[PDB]
Amino acid sequence: DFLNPKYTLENFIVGEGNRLAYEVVKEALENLGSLYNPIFIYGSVGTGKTHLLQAAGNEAKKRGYRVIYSSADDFAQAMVEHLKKGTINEFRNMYKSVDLLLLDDVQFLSGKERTQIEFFHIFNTLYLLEKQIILASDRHPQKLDGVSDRLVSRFEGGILVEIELDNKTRFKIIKEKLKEFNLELRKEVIDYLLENTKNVREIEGKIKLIKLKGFEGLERKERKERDKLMQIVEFVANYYAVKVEDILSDKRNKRTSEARKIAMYLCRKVCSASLIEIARAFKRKDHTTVIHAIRSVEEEKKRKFKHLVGFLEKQAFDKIC
C-alpha cells in the first residue's frame, strides 16, 4: 500500500486555507466512492497534499479497505517495469482491485503516454465500480500540459479543491514543531519562524540551525550574512560608478538597472543568498524581478560579458567572503 502511518486526519491541523480539501476528503470517507469521484487536490509545495492523501489512506485501511498509494512517477516507473518483466497484467489487476486509489503528484504524468493510457483504464474501472479515487497535483488540471484531454475532463467531472497553508495554520504548526524539537514557545522564536518560513521543511531547517547555534546565534549569523550582501552592493557601486543610495530602487536608468542585475547576481552566486534574502536585501518584496534579472545575466553568456561578471565574482569573494 505504501502508507506512512505518521500522517493522520487527526494530526492534520485545519485552517481556512485547507478546510475545503479537509472537509471534502472527510465527507468522502463516510461515503467512499459515492459522493465525490474523483477528488483532485492541488496546491503549492508543502501545503498538505501528501499528508492529506496518506491520512485518508490510513483511515480507509484502519476501517478495512484495500488501499494503494503511489506518486505518479513511481507509478510510471512501476508500470514500465512490469511491462518488460511480462507482468503488465499483475500491474493492472493490482490497481483495479482497490477500494481507494491515491495518486500523488499527477503533474508528473506528462509525457508518459503509456502510463496515462494505463491509468485511464484503471481510473475507468475503479470509477464504474464506484471505487474512490483521490488525486493530488501541484497545479490545476487546466494547467496539466502533457496530460491527455480525456484524463483532464474526467478529473473535471469530480471535485477540484485548492489547498493552502495559511498563516494561522503555520503558526499552530510552528508551535507543534517547537515542542517536537524541545524548544520553548517564546514569542520571538515563534515570530522569527512566522516571518521566515512557508513550509514545514523551512521550519525544520531553521530549527536545526537554532539547536546548533542557539536562537541568538542564528540571528547573529543572519545579521552577518545581510552585512555581506550590503558589502556586495557597496562593491558593485565603487566599480560601476553608482552610489549605494541609488543602487537600491526601481529607478530604470541602465546605469543603475544594469548594476542592480549583476549585484543580485553576485548576491546569489557569490554569497549563496536565497531569492527571498536577495529580494529583502534590495528593498522590494515580490518574486518576478529577481528571477528574470538573474536570467538576463545568463543571456549574456551566449566569451564576452562572462569574463567581466567572472572577474567581479572573484573580487567580491576576496573582499567580502
Ligand X SMILES: Nc1ncnc2c1ncn2[C@@H]1O[C@H](COP(=O)(O)OP(=O)(O)O)[C@@H](O)[C@H]1O
Closer residue to ligand X in complex, CB, 11/34: 11
Neighbouring C-beta atoms of residue 238, cutoff 10 Å: 10
Q: Write down the least CB distance from residue 50 to ligand X, Å.
A: 3
Nine cell digits for residue 280: 529583502
Query: Which residue among 173, 270, 278, 316 contacts ligand X (CB under 6 A)?
Result: 173
54 in contact with Mg ion (CB under 5 A):
no
49 in contact with Mg ion (CB under 5 A):
yes
Closer residue to Mg ion in complex, CB, 4/87: 4
Q: Are the C-beta atoms of residues 276 and 198 closer than 8 Å to each other?
A: no
Q: Write down the least CB distance from residue 255 to ligand X, Å.
A: 43
18 in contact with Mg ion (CB under 5 A):
no
The greatest distance separating any two alpha carbons of the chain, rounded to the nearest whole angstrom, comes to 72
Q: Are the C-beta atoms of residues 320 and 228 closer than 8 Å to each other?
A: yes
> Is 286 annotated as contributing to ligand binding?
no
Contacts with ligand X, 29-48, as mask; x by CB under 6 A: --------------x-xxxx
# of chain residues touching ligand X (CB under 6 A): 16
Closer residue to ligand X in complex, CB, 200/294: 200
Peptide bond into 38 cis (omega under 30): yes
Residues 184-243 close enough to bind ligand X by CB under 6 A:
200
Q: List Cα–Cα distances, 89 to 67, 83, 102, 117, 161, in angstroms.
A: 18, 8, 20, 14, 33
- The backbone torsions φ and ψ at residue 145, rounded to the nearest 5 degrees and listed phi first, read -65, 145
SS3 at position 159 = strand
108 in contact with ligand X (CB under 6 A):
no
Q: Which segments are annotated as binding site for ATP?
A: 13, 46, 48-51, 104, 201
